[PDB]
Symmetry: C2
Subunit: 309 residues, 2 copies
């Protein structure tokens, strides 16, 4: 099949629009979201048709930036407010079944400050849910791990965990992988306790949370391995995606394997989301000097669930 | 330098004595501990001198098994009680500065039951300390990780952790590696919380336990990296040994890297200890059919801190 991927062009005065058009020109999934006048500046410079666009380079005009403000590259309140307008519109499109994945192109933290930014939670807000219901899916070195809990003290995460998060984390990951072309993803649930509690010997958290969720998912047809001690489970190459119960459980193995050749998307909000930004290339903006590679990386991540090494 | 390694021959009616003599014959470290008459049966069969032995094949006679009971291979109360006598004597020798490491050769769980076994804690008892003060050092794939806490619920381990365990785990690992020929081992302390608590943001466990221990060890001259988020730390090849704060933190990365090509010793009791046993080869005992490989594996583990892949 083909996913449709929205690229929100990022800071209009930055490098985003340039790499967004560059990525789209090269190009099994692409619909740009941004001020059409901003995108056109860059397209003419290196190109094909551009159609304002239901379905059928394609772009959706999201009107934000005063023309007066378009100068590559400084930024202003308006260009910071625009970056988020584009993301907002791309997420609205996802809500309307139009778009499968949203990629946020590089932005400027100083411009967003100027306007009156942090995506996973901005995404959560827009989508009508708390931050805790969006889950980080970390990919690299042939591993894909969604995290039921993330940035907090491990004594706090253990307390947050319940059947709801583990079930929502697993279903979101299956659906993501299905969109990615993995028809029947094998899910691996990591044990909360070592050895997934060893028949109650190490406590009853797995008996309470991951065992009942495992049974429920299997009854809805999914193939689910576990819960099993994470140290055994991750040795199994037959698993397509793993549910880690806390930050370190999934961050250690991906980073050990892949190091820097890894990347993240957020799932659970009813869209595959990722961000590209290592800042807006302001001092090279306009010049067409931007390389699209990091962005083609994110497209690859959301459509394939792999990271090249 | 050279370590001296005690091989406690295991069940006299089993394969232990055979592989113990076989290992010793091949053979930069070896002193057998067992009934001399049991060891001699096997030596004559494939050999060199054997000297009963302070310092200078070498063996220490540990008198346990009635001769009447020596038959390879069935077992009896007496041969189960002998296996543990040999280990006991080897640990006494370690206590007397005579021996650096003790390896327990294969035993028989049914014979030990018959007599009136579980080593890490048997070791702890003999050495005059509780089980919780001996730490598992897990090695493979170029990683060496000592665990401050091990087989219990992760909510229970978090509660057990204190500066004392982390300090004792780190010092024991340094001393082990020094015995192994690593003069100046670089120690890596894993963060209890993700990102080692991110400046208190994720809680204060690292501020309380691993930060003060890190400062203390550095003041006693050791080079200590961390505490740092375990997912970053383990990416550092400059570290010679890591202190994991709970079971999964150290079991995930060693097993991910090395799988089955990994092995464990216990440290912290004032001896490097490991066991070889996958049961006594009773139906092949006598025949000289035993391969010494698993035992040469354990010798390699305790003298070098590596596992061949
Ligand atoms: Zn993190
Ligand atoms: Zn275990």
């Amino acid at each position: 099949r083909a996913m449709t991927v929205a690229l929100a062009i990022g800071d209009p005065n930055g490098i985003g629009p340039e790499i967004a058009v560059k990525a789209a020109a090269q190009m099994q999934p692409i619909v740009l979201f941004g001020d059409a006048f901003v995108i056109r500046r860059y397209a003419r410079q290196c190109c094909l048709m551009l159609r304002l666009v239901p379905s059928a380079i394609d772009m959706v005009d999201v009107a934000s930036l005063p023309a007066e403000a378009f100068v590559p590259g400084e930024v202003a309140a308006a260009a910071g407010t625009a970056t988020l307008a584009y993301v907002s519109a791309a997420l609205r499109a996802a809500r309307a079944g139009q778009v499968d994945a949203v990629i946020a192109c590089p932005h400027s933290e100083t411009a967003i400050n100027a306007s009156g930014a942090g995506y996973p939670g901005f995404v959560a807000h827009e989508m009508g849910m708390p931050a805790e219901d969006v889950y980080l899916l970390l990919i690299g070195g042939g591993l894909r791990i969604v995290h039921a809990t993330l940035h907090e003290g491990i004594a706090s995460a253990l307390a947050r965990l319940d059947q709801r998060h583990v079930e929502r984390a697993a279903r979101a990951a299956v659906q993501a992988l299905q969109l990615m072309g993995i028809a029947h993803p094998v899910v691996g649930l990591m044990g909360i306790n070592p050895h997934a509690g060893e028949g109650g010997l190490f406590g009853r958290d797995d008996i309470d949370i991951t065992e009942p969720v495992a049974r429920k998912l299997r009854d809805d047809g999914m193939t689910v391995i576990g819960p099993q001690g994470a140290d055994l489970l991750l040795t199994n190459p037959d698993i397509d995606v793993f549910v880690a119960m806390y930050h370190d459980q999934g961050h250690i193995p991906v980073k050990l394997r892949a190091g820097r050749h890894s990347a993240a998307l957020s799932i659970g909000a009813g869209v595959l989301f990722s961000s590209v930004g290592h800042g807006s290339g302001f001092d090279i903006a306009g010049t067409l000097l931007a390389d699209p590679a990091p962005l083609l990386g994110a497209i690859r991540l959301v459509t394939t669930g792999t990271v090249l090494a």
